[PDB]
Each structure stands twice: as structure tokens, then as C-alpha cells.
Amino acid sequence: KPLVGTGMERAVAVDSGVTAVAKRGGVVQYVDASRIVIKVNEDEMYPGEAGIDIYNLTKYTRSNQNTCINQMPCVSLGEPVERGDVLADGPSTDLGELALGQNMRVAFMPWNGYNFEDSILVSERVVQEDRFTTIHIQELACVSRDTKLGPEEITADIPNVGEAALSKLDESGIVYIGAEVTGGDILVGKVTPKGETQLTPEEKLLRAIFGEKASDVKDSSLRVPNGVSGTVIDVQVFTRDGVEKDKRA
Amino acid sequence: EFLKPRLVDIEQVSSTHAKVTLEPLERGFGHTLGNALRRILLSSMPGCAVTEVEIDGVLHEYSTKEGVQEDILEILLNLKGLAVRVQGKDEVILTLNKSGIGPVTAADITHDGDVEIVKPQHVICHLTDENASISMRIKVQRGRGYVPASTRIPIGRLLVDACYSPVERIAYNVEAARVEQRTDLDKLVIEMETNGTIDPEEAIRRAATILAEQLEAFVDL
Amino acid sequence: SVTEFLKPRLVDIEQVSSTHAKVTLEPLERGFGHTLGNALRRILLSSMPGCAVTEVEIDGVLHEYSTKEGVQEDILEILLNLKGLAVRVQGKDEVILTLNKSGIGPVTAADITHDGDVEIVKPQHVICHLTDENASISMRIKVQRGRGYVPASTRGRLLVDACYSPVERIAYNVEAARVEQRTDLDKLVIEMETNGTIDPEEAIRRAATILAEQLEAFV
Amino acid sequence: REEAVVWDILDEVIREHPVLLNRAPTLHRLGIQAFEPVLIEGKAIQLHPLV
Amino acid sequence: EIKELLKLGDLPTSGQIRLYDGRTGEQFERPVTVGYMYMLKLNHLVDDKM
Amino acid sequence: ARVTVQDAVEKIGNRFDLVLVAARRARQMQVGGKDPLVPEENDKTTVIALREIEEGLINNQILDVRERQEQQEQEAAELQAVT
Amino acid sequence: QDVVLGLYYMTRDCVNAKGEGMVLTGPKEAERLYRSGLASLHARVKVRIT
Numbered sequence A: 001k002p003l004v005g006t007g008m009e010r011a012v013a014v015d016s017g018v019t020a021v022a023k024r025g026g027v028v029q030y031v032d033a034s035r036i037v038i039k040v041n042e043d044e045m046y047p048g049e050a051g052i053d054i055y056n057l058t059k060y061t062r063s064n065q066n067t068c069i070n071q072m073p074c075v076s077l078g079e080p081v082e083r084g085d086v087l088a089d090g091p092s093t094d095l096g097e098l099a100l101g102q103n104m105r106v107a108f109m110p111w112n113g114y115n116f117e118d119s120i121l122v123s124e125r126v127v128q129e130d131r132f133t134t135i136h137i138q139e140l141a142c143v144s145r146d147t148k149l150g151p152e153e154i155t156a157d158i159p160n161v162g163e164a165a166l167s168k169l170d171e172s173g174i175v176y177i178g179a180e181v182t183g184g185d186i187l188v189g190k191v192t193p194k195g196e197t198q199l200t201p202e203e204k205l206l207r208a209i210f211g212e213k214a215s216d217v218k219d220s221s222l223r224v225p226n227g228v229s230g231t232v233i234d235v236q237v238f239t240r241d242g243v244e245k246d247k248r249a
Numbered sequence B: 001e002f003l004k005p006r007l008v009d010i011e012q013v014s015s016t017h018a019k020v021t022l023e024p025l026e027r028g029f030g031h032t033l034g035n036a037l038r039r040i041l042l043s044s045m046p047g048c049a050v051t052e053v054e055i056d057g058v059l060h061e062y063s064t065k066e067g068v069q070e071d072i073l074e075i076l077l078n079l080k081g082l083a084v085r086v087q088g089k090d091e092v093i094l095t096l097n098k099s100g101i102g103p104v105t106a107a108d109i110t111h112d113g114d115v116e117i118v119k120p121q122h123v124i125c126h127l128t129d130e131n132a133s134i135s136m137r138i139k140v141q142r143g144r145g146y147v148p149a150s151t152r153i154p155i156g157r158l159l160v161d162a163c164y165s166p167v168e169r170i171a172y173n174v175e176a177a178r179v180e181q182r183t184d185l186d187k188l189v190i191e192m193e194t195n196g197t198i199d200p201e202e203a204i205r206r207a208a209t210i211l212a213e214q215l216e217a218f219v220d221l
Numbered sequence C: 001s002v003t004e005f006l007k008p009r010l011v012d013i014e015q016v017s018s019t020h021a022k023v024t025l026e027p028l029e030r031g032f033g034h035t036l037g038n039a040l041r042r043i044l045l046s047s048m049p050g051c052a053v054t055e056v057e058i059d060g061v062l063h064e065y066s067t068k069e070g071v072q073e074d075i076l077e078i079l080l081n082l083k084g085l086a087v088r089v090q091g092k093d094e095v096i097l098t099l100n101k102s103g104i105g106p107v108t109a110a111d112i113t114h115d116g117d118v119e120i121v122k123p124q125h126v127i128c129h130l131t132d133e134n135a136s137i138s139m140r141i142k143v144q145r146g147r148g149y150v151p152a153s154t155r156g157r158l159l160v161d162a163c164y165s166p167v168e169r170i171a172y173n174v175e176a177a178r179v180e181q182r183t184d185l186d187k188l189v190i191e192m193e194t195n196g197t198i199d200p201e202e203a204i205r206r207a208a209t210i211l212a213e214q215l216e217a218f219v
Numbered sequence D: 001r002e003e004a005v006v007w008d009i010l011d012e013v014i015r016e017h018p019v020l021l022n023r024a025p026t027l028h029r030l031g032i033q034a035f036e037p038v039l040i041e042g043k044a045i046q047l048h049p050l051v
Numbered sequence E: 001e002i003k004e005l006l007k008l009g010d011l012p013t014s015g016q017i018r019l020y021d022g023r024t025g026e027q028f029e030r031p032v033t034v035g036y037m038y039m040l041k042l043n044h045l046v047d048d049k050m
Numbered sequence F: 001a002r003v004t005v006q007d008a009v010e011k012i013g014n015r016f017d018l019v020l021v022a023a024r025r026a027r028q029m030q031v032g033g034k035d036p037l038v039p040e041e042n043d044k045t046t047v048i049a050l051r052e053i054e055e056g057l058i059n060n061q062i063l064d065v066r067e068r069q070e071q072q073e074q075e076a077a078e079l080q081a082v083t
Numbered sequence G: 001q002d003v004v005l006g007l008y009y010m011t012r013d014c015v016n017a018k019g020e021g022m023v024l025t026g027p028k029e030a031e032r033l034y035r036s037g038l039a040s041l042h043a044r045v046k047v048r049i050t
Helices: A009-015 A124-128 A201-209 B029-043 B072-080 B200-216 C032-046 C075-083 C200-213 D006-014 E002-008 F006-011 F017-030 F045-054 F060-076 F078-082 G002-010 G027-036
Strands: A026-031 A035-040 A052-056 A102-108 A186-188 B006-011 B018-025 B050-055 B091-099 B102-105 B123-127 B133-141 B167-176 B186-194 C009-013 C020-028 C049-058 C087-089 C094-102 C105-107 C118-120 C128-130 C136-147 C157-159 C167-172 C186-194 D019-022 D032-035 E032-039
Touching: B006 B200, B018 B029, B018 B200, B029 B167, B029 B186, B029 B200, B029 C032, B050 B072, B072 B123, B091 B102, B091 B123, B123 B133, B186 B200, B200 C032, B200 C200, C020 C032, C020 C200, C032 C167, C032 C186, C032 C200, C032 G027, C049 C075, C049 C087, C087 C136, C167 G027, C186 C200, F006 F017, F006 F045, F017 F045, F017 F060, F060 F078
Parallel strands: none
Antiparallel strands: A026 A035, A035 A052, A102 E032, B006 B018, B018 B186, B050 B133, B091 B133, B102 B123, B167 B186, C009 C020, C020 C186, C049 C136, C049 C157, C087 C118, C094 C136, C105 C128, C167 C186, D019 D032
């Protein structure tokens, strides 16, 4: 809530559709953290199609600049709300206003050179309160392409590693929701037909008659990038229609 | 000879904050001990804040729970604001159980009688449906200073940042002590703010213990 | 654990001549370098027992902005010389001294009589210079024990700035040093001169003794 | 793995080994000067203000 | 009107409050400006540029 | 201890052959066979080389004399242990 | 920029301050007077320099 505002915060909050403005005013029937259900007042109500307004909020999900977009219910249980009033504060909003940063006790003085050219010297009270602590979200994909020497498996059977990586993978090879991963781990175990021998046509006839496969393999799993940590909060699995599904799918 | 101070008055002006008075001081030692004790009281006082939270039907702290209006992360920040005394342990696991519509206060926790909840009106979250219930295990441990999540680090046990600091604001003010039929003696008066879990005499006594050790580093006691 | 700290110990005395020393303390808890250096600075610079030249009366002087012949210096500059006369005195609290000389040359501290419990750290401390055979000096100089600094405006008698405390400069440089898994600590670097009446490490132990005694009714 | 002994090794390979700082619009030759490292718990290159 | 609103609180009309140092414990000369500025965290984070 | 190079530059007034002389000497102390003429303060070989220049006991000419002396020593071992 | 402000505030004078026109044995006790607060940082004073 910017203490020194210009009053145009309301118009930017209401007009830019990142808050949940009520279509028809009425009475809160049920506020949960994910949906808000409003019973509608009578004079704004249609005779047929009895009608209650159900606003499904959009919870923690990725924005285009890898920031977190999140709506929070700012009304109580059983509260009169009017048509055109906001029901859910989105990102950087506070009770229908606009709140980008936070307002802090500032002092204008040199303090032993730590704010020399344009630097800013900050207390520990700021970092203790988690008041600039923000949430970033990375979408990491792993694709399974149909390649030579057969297509690739997404199985947990991975060469040259043990239970040190497999301790955070399930029966299918895909990380559990909620795993607190760091840099260097394995999120989606993908394995490749390695060996790359290019056996001769004589050896091709040899392996064609006598019937011996290759059965060598290289790790090409989807790994965490360097430096980053975090929490797997959502796993989406998409599959071509001519492909069978494994068990986590 | 230098005259030596004594804890002469402790005015419990509220449940949060109280004022001590150090008296009598030689001229000069007022600001010296005042700055030193402000430094030690803000720096290192053993607090007992929350460390790890384990809600039952919740995987990770970036999710929602069907039947409570606040997110899991806001529940964790509301727990981070909780002040709680332990007496005869170092770590402890509290337990909250509640259902029905109504604000889930800090008073609803299982008591575990050596564990004192210093503020019952402190809300955690608001349940919102009759057939809705939360049930969490709140791991509280003793600590010192500020230990965030990333330094000291199953998939259910969420971690809050640890903020083991029972003071909030220290405000010492010297003034002349007109006593002993002798002028020019200082009177140190410290107004200390506390979340509620620390006796201010025990606060100033732990602080002076700390200074006695830090000078015991090179003098004989 | 919550009482266990990182109690330091002084590692060196990288000293220069016996009135000066550069004491380092390492390693300290984060935030203790400034409070220890500041507490010891305010105690050494404010309240230290010590004797010092307090009030001086000259034979034929009734005013500071004056002169007396046979003296290359002035009255005000001879009082500047009298400030630096670093004097230790035994169990007598205060005592009056006198100085008499007629000669040509400097007047050093060895010209002062030995009588009393008064010991001078440097006879080589030149008070003034003389130029005439018939120029006879006669001054009465009163030392007095005290507790640090009292100026002339907060006191033919002349008002000398009273500097009882033996230290002449104290400064600290809290710089950072590390332990193995620890992040950031302090390295208190005390730099200190005296006036000669005490050697420096004993003066730091005086400061620690006084700050310890001022906390005895608490711990 | 960044074990415990590599940081003393690192402080003993820093000690007199210079680096070159370099700002991106490097116009004249003072835009590349050579320093000595002091290690930092942090992620930002500390740089002496008079430079 | 800013001065009149500061007079509605018990704050000084000058806008400047005397401040002590946390290190030396003694008052800075020439009292300084304290207040509330609404400061933003821009997303040029150092652990992305490093 | 090392902060500047200035006295080494004042003894070898080129500032471009200081690098070459100290490089040759620090190779003699690194790879190197030889041992330092100045007591080291747990320094790198670079600082020990510049420190030996600052004492005024290494230049290009001392290195040339000692390399001629080592080349003359390389026959008095072989010609002695063969013949 | 900061250091020149610090020096320009340091080496200046005002017509009346603490310890106006007293005499000092040298700069070491000038610092000893400043840190106690008994003299202000800008106060015209005869000292002995060397």
C-alpha cells in the first residue's frame, strides 16, 4: 500500500485485468483460497437462470517474465459487495489498489562509504521480514523425440547413477511434486540408445540372423540448471495420440 | 574509586515492553554501557521461534488447501510471527487441530504445559467451511540470531525462516541521577521492547554475562 | 549453543616503541568488534586514573598573553610544554612542585627537583630554552590525580588543561576474518599510544578491568 | 561437491594472483586495471571507490 | 499542507530528526531526514547476471 | 609483502624489461630447479622475483652470468663421468 | 563525491563552537578532544603542528 500515492492506483488495478472484479454485486456465500462464490442481489439479478457468481481464482503460476502471478481473496465470509468491486487482489495489488514495492524507513546521509555513487545500504530488518523476498518460476521441458536406433525411454533405469538421483524419482522416472531440488539433480530421467557402433552390412546380416540386440544406453535426463534451487510445484505430461501412456501419465 | 551500578527498577509498563533502570553510574559510563547493552540485547538473545511446519494434507508450501482462505505460504508467515516460550527443552513439536468455521487462533494449539503460548489472540489463518479442518505439527526449537532456510539446509516437512530474536526495539536514555547527596551521576534507563518470552532482568543479565565473557577473553576473573 | 560464543584471544602485539602498540583481537562474533572497540575507546579516552599537571603559577606573571625575558619561548607555549610532562606519582593524591634555574640553554624535566613521590617518565622532555646568564626561572607547578580529561574552561595562577588519562590516541579498525564454515566475523585491531606513564597492553588490561568491575552486580 | 578443504586451497591460490577488471564500454586504457582478489561471501564484485 | 500534517502528528515540522549511530552510540551532528519512501525491487537480480 | 613495484622499476628503469627479468627469475624459482635468495613469506614466485629485484641483487646481467656458469658446469660433470 | 563532502565538512570553521580558542599540544589530543565531544570539529584553535 504506497503511502504516497496519486489516486490513479485504483484505475490501473481495476482496468488491467489482473484482479477479479465482480460482474454482478451481491453477498459472499463462500470464500476459499481458490474460488469465491457470491450470491447475487435481487435488482441486479435475472428472473430465469437463478444464478450465483463463481470466480475461480488463478493461483501460483508462471508469468511471461518468469515471475509469479497469484490472486488472493480480499473479502471476508458473508460480506456485502457491490457491482464493479474487486474480489481478489492479484499480483502487486493491495485491497484493490496498486502496490509494486514496499514502503520503508529511509534516511538520507552518508554512512561510512557503503552508499558511494548510487549504492543503497539496507538493514537486516528488511531481509528478516521477508519483505522483498519474491517468487520466481522456471518452466523446464523434456521432449522425447523419435530418433535412430529406436526412440528414447523416460524410464528410471539410468546408467552410471545410483539411488543418489533415483531417491527423488518415482516408479515412472518423473520427479514428485514437492521435491526440494538443488542444482545438479535429475528431474526427468531420459535414456538414449547409445553404442553408436555403425556395424557393417555383414555384421548387420549377422545380428539379423543370429538375433542379438545392442542394449547399450546413455543418460540424457532433464537435469536442474546450475545455481538454481526450489520446489517442483507442477508437472504436466503431454503425449501423442499414437503413443501408449506410462503410469504417472 | 569508581561507583558501580545496580538494577534498581523494572517497570512492567505492558505485556510486550518494559523499562529497566541502571543506577548509579559514573559520568561517562552511561552512554558506554547503554550502547553496549543495546548492541548485545539486539544481537544475541536466545529466542524460541518456529522452525519447521508440517501440515497434513499439503505437499509443498506453494499450494492451496480446500477449505481455508489463506494460502499455505501466508500460514507460514503467520507462524513466523509467533512468539512462544519453552522452558525445559531445546526443541519441541507443537500440534494444532481445529475444524469448523472460525479464525484459527494460536490458542487452539495443544498446550504441552511447559510450552507457553505468550499471545493467544494471534491468528494463524481462517477456516472457512464446516467440514474443513487443518492439522499441523509445528516444530519449534531454541536458537540465537537469524538463521534463514538456505543456510542450515521427506517432502512434507515445510521450512520457515527462523527469526530467533525476542527483542524488537531497544531505547536507552541517560539522565542525571540526583542522589547520594552528590551531583554528576548518570542514570541509565533502557526501554526494551519484547515479543513476550523474555524477562527484561534476564535480558540485561544475559547481556552483561556476554560482555563479561568477551572481556574474559584477555583479563583474569 | 545459544550461550556458546567464539571467545577470541589476542594474537600479536605488532608494536613500535614502548609507548605505542597495535593490538589485534581475533576472531569475534559478528557485531562484537564495534561494541568492544567502542566501549574500550570511551573508557580509555574518558575515564582513566592518572596524575597530570593541573595548575601552574609563575613568579612574575599575572596574565597568559604576556612574556618574560630570557625565554626564547612564550608563556602559552611553555604551558603547551607543561601539558606533555607525563608524570607518575605514588600514594600521594596531589602535591606541589617547583622549578628554579638560571642558565643558558634548554630547561629539561631533569631540572625539576626529585622531592616528593614524583617520578618523571622522560627527563629529556624539554620545557623551555634560556638565553641569558642572569635569566632566572622560578615556577610553581601543581600535579593532581584525576579521571581523564578536564579542560581549562571547565576548571598569578594559570589554568592548564588537565589530561589525566595516560592514552593519547586510540583507534580501532574492525576488519573481517573467517573461520572454516563460518561466514563472517570480526578482527578488532586496536592501535594505541600512551604518554609513557604506562605501557600499552597494561592500559588495555586497565580498561578491561574497569569495564569488568562496572558489570559485577549483574553477571 | 565443494568440500571443506578446497576453500583453504583457494585462499592459498588467490594470495598473490591478480585478476583484470574491465568495464564494458572500455574507452581509454584505465578501463582495464588489475587488482588482487579478496574473497567475498556474496555475489557482487566489490570495487574500490576511487577507481 | 505537509507541514500542517506533520503538526497533526507529533513529528517535527522541519522534517529532520536527530539520529544516533549504532556503532559509536553518539548523536550525529546536524539532524537528518528520515521518512518513508516507497522503494521497489527491480528484476535485475545479481544471481541472474553473475 | 607486495603493494607496488616501484623500487624494482627504479633499479631497472625500463618498466618493460622488469616483466622479462622477473619472469625469467620466477621461472627459475617455479619449475625451476633453483631456490629463492630472499626468505619467502609464503608468497608466490612472482612476488619473490620482484622482491629479489627490490634488493638490487638480480638484473639481466646476474642471470646471464649464472647461466654461463651453469653452462660451464654442464661439461665438468659429463666430461668427468665419461672420461 | 562522499569523501570530498566529508573533508569539506571536516576542514572548515565557524565563529563559535565548543573549545573556541583553546590551545593544544598537538593533533593527537585534538582527536582526543573531538571524540569526547568536548570540542567541536570546526573550532578555531592554536595547536602545535610539526
